[PDB]
Amino acid sequence: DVYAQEKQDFVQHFSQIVRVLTEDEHPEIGDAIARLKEVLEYNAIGGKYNRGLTVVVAFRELVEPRKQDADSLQRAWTVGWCVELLQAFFLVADDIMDSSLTRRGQICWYQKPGVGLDAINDANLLEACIYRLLKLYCREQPYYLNLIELFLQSSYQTEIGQTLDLLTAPQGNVDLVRFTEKRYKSIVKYKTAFYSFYLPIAAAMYMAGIDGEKEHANAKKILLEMGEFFQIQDDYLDLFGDPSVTGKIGTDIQDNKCSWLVVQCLQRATPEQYQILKENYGQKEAEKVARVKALYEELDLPAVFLQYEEDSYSHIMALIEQYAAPLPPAVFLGLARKIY
Amino acid sequence: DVYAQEKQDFVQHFSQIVRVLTEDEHPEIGDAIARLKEVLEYNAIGGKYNRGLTVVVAFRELVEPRKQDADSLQRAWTVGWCVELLQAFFLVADDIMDSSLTRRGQICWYQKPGVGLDAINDANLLEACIYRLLKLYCREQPYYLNLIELFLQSSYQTEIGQTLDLLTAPQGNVDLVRFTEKRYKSIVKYKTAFYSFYLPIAAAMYMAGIDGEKEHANAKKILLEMGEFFQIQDDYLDLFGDPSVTGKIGTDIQDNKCSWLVVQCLQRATPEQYQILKENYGQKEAEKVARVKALYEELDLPAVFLQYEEDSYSHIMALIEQYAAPLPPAVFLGLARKIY
Numbered sequence: 001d002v003y004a005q006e007k008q009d010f011v012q013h014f015s016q017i018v019r020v021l022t023e024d025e026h027p028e029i030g031d032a033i034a035r036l037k038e039v040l041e042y043n044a045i046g047g048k049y050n051r052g053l054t055v056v057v058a059f060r061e062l063v064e065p066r067k068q069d070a071d072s073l074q075r076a077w078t079v080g081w082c083v084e085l086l087q088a089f090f091l092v093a094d095d096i097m098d099s100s101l102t103r104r105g106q107i108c109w110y111q112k113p114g115v116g117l118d119a120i121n122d123a124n125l126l127e128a129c130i131y132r133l134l135k136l137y138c139r140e141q142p143y144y145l146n147l148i149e150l151f152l153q154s155s156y157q158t159e160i161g162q163t164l165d166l167l168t169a170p171q172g173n174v175d176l177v178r179f180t181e182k183r184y185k186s187i188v189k190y191k192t193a194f195y196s197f198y199l200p201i202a203a204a205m206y207m208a209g210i211d212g213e214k215e216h217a218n219a220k221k222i223l224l225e226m227g228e229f230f231q232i233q234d235d236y237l238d239l240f241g242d243p244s245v246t247g248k249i250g251t252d253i254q255d256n257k258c259s260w261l262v263v264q265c266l267q268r269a270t271p272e273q274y275q276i277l278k279e280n281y282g283q284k285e286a287e288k289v290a291r292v293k294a295l296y297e298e299l300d301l302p303a304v305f306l307q308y309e310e311d312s313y314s315h316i317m318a319l320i321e322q323y324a325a326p327l328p329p330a331v332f333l334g335l336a337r338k339i340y
Numbered sequence: 341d342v343y344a345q346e347k348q349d350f351v352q353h354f355s356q357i358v359r360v361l362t363e364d365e366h367p368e369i370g371d372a373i374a375r376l377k378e379v380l381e382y383n384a385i386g387g388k389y390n391r392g393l394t395v396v397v398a399f400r401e402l403v404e405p406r407k408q409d410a411d412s413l414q415r416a417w418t419v420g421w422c423v424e425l426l427q428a429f430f431l432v433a434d435d436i437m438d439s440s441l442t443r444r445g446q447i448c449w450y451q452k453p454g455v456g457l458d459a460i461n462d463a464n465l466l467e468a469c470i471y472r473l474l475k476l477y478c479r480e481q482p483y484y485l486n487l488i489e490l491f492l493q494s495s496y497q498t499e500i501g502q503t504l505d506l507l508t509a510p511q512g513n514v515d516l517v518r519f520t521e522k523r524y525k526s527i528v529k530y531k532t533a534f535y536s537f538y539l540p541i542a543a544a545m546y547m548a549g550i551d552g553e554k555e556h557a558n559a560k561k562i563l564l565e566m567g568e569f570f571q572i573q574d575d576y577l578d579l580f581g582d583p584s585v586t587g588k589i590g591t592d593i594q595d596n597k598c599s600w601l602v603v604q605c606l607q608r609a610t611p612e613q614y615q616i617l618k619e620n621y622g623q624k625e626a627e628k629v630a631r632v633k634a635l636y637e638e639l640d641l642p643a644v645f646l647q648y649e650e651d652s653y654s655h656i657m658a659l660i661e662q663y664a665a666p667l668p669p670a671v672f673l674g675l676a677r678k679i680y
């Protein structure tokens with residue numbers, strides 16, 4: 001709830017992010033700057049803002065309260081919004097690739113009549129805005145290069161993980177043999193854990209002058225495990241979550257994804273069960289999807305996940321004991337409350 | 341031909357670029373690193389390499405010959421390859437958006453069975469490789485941040501121009517009223533001139549320690565005019581070029597693009613001619629495309645372009661007289677020979 005209390009100030013900072021990214025007036029590019037406005041306003045607004053808020057929360061907890069001036073706070077909010085622009089970049093492009101229908105309780109940007117594959121460019125523009133903001137707000141700060149490199153490396157890591165995800169789920173093809181626990185863990189580490197958990201904390205760290213490689217290493221050790229659980233929960237909720245809460249309809253089964261659920265199913269299924277999965281997974285047909293979900297419940301995977309969450313919670317807590325120091329344990333515990 | 345003579349060394353450096361971008365062995369990401377190899381090898385190889393070579397040529401002409409050690413040359417070749425990775429990023433994604441068929445004398449990457457919209461991620465990976473290479477080769481150099489920012493700003497500029505291009509060509513809609521000379525010039529300035537001409541020269545400049553804002557301003561003044569002509573010639577060749585040479589089939593007419601040709605047509609057409617254009621432009625049907633081309637030749641636009649090229653050549657030469665100094669005129673004249 002340190003989140004709920006940073007939230008409203010964070011969110012109302014968006015008008016400012018937009019204003020400053022539109023103050024590029026070169027009246028010739030006006031029309032394009034109007035399209036970027038639309039893209040920002042549809043695509044970085046409507047989510048929970050947990051990643052960006054994490055930057056703002058950690059900043060408050062890591063920076064000497066006396067050093068938390070109005071300007072250095074403005075920068076923290078900006079850097080928070082940079083993390084959210086990164087997520088918007090990935091979501092817009094991934095919804096295209098995944099043939100998704102809805103996101104954050106509206107139709108996907110690319111599904112909007114008049115948009116379509118132009119959304120590929122809109123998504124690149126959102127990524128570009130990250131670096132314009134880091135320049136506008138942070139160029140004179142000691143950690144400038146630290147942040148640029150962090151965001152660029154995070155993106156690379158995320159794209160490499162998405163590569164592994166897509167390679168593991170070739171379309172129109174059967175292959176449950178690809179869906180291993182080792183593969184799953186690598187996927188989610190790269191595609192999710194680095195940018196969703198390491199990135200926002202590291203960002204705050206760099207901003208507070210904590211640049212030591214051992215401190216980042218120790219932070220990473222906790223944050224990457226949190227990231228893995230988070231992706232696992234996102235997988236479970238793809239099928240068993242309520243779209244009123246998730247804000248989107250799940251496609252993992254028909255997309256032939258190496259989801260946590262399918263990996264657990266394969267670990268538990270009998271040869272017969274295996275064959276049902278083989279016949280029905282990775283296909284567009286509602287009755288086929290329904291059969292897989294029936295098999296998952298058949299195997300009580302909702303209960304397996306509930307037990308995994310508890311085991312994971314306990315393990316993450318152990319890691320925080322082991323690795324949090326020299327940083328305030330609250331930094332990690334705020335995050336843990338948010339996700340468990 | 342300073343190009344032809346830098347070329348073979350530049351091109352053979354590619355195996356090294358690839359090797360070092362694959363030496364990320366984390367055996368878990370092996371499969372993804374294999375996909376990146378494929379993507380590099382299909383998408384950054386098969387073009388003329390003029391943009392990357394321009395970095396290498398300008399570097400030779402701008403750097404004290406005594407300062408041209410083996411290491412600082414390796415960096416010049418790397419930075420050249422960075423410009424080519426930027427072009428590969430844009431081409432892969434733009435071919436998707438433009439529904440293109442072929443590029444550089446093969447089928448487009450995304451049209452390859454097994455690829456499709458996954459190419460969106462492959463293209464982002466290529467962009468990511470730029471920054472991994474700048475880090476691997478250039479992180480300890482004084483101009484590191486200069487280069488990072490140049491590449492990021494160039495991308496932003498290019499994406500903003502593509503935004504204007506796509507907004508000016510709404511699909512399924514008539515509108516020749518959008519196709520003005522003022523609009524055309526803004527489009528090509530942003531979408532083409534900055535990254536194709538300013539970027540590679542500026543890069544060499546920064547590498548040679550020439551960072552003064554007046555020197556970059558003067559360079560820009562010539563390079564941006566060259567860029568505009570280059571896009572004009574690319575437009576003309578979209579329809580009237582030979583696909584054996586261009587390596588791709590032109591879609592500007594059926595894509596409803598604000599091309600140089602359509603702008604000139606509109607300036608010259610009678611009300612009747614206007615109506616033929618209105619009925620036939622921006623549509624998929626071969627007979628409709630054929631009618632527009634017939635109207636263009638009807639108006640002798642090939643001859644208009646031939647005269648424009650000569651006028652443009654003379655004007656660029658005047659600009660080089662005016663603005664080249666303090667830099668070797670050869671820097672700009674090599675480029676001019678390459679494009680005219």
Ligand SMILES: O=P(O)(O)C(O)([C@@H]1CCc2ccncc21)P(=O)(O)O
Nearest residue numbers: 090091094098158191192234235238
């Ligand atoms: O689409 P979401 O379920 O929100 C997902 O978690 C998000 C979407 C964008 C993105 C990028 C990296 N990792 C996860 C996600 P995905 O399941 O696609 O991997």
Ligand SMILES: O=P(O)(O)C(O)([C@@H]1CCc2ccncc21)P(=O)(O)O
Nearest residue numbers: 430431434438498531532574575578
């Ligand atoms: O597709 P090409 O004709 O090669 C083009 O010149 C290239 C393709 C990628 C790109 C990016 C920016 N400017 C021009 C191009 P376009 O006509 O699409 O604008």
Ligand SMILES: [Mg+2]
Nearest residue numbers: 234235238252
């Ligand atoms: Mg998901």
Ligand SMILES: [Mg+2]
Nearest residue numbers: 574575578592
């Ligand atoms: Mg063209």
